[PDB]
Amino acid sequence: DHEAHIKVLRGEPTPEEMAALMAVLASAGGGPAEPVKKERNMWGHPVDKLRYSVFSWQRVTLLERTHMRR
């Protein structure tokens, strides 16, 4: 077992007070942060708006990098 658990570092609550603590913390706990269906959509990405000199190395290290990074 290698999960990181909640620790009551001080105090010794009764099982009712444990239940109250858990129901509060569990309903306070954040919802679906970092959502599972964050689609990719590169339409109009800011890197395509920039002017690049025809020989600008940022055409490799910014533009192509940004399109191809997955």
Partner: peptide, 18 residues
């Protein structure tokens, strides 16, 4: 799983309470 001074205490809740 919750620990009280390091004593293990398995707790169970419904899968959502938010």
């Amino acid at each position: 799983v919750v620990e009280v001074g390091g004593r293990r205490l398995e707790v169970s809740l419904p899968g959502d309470l938010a």
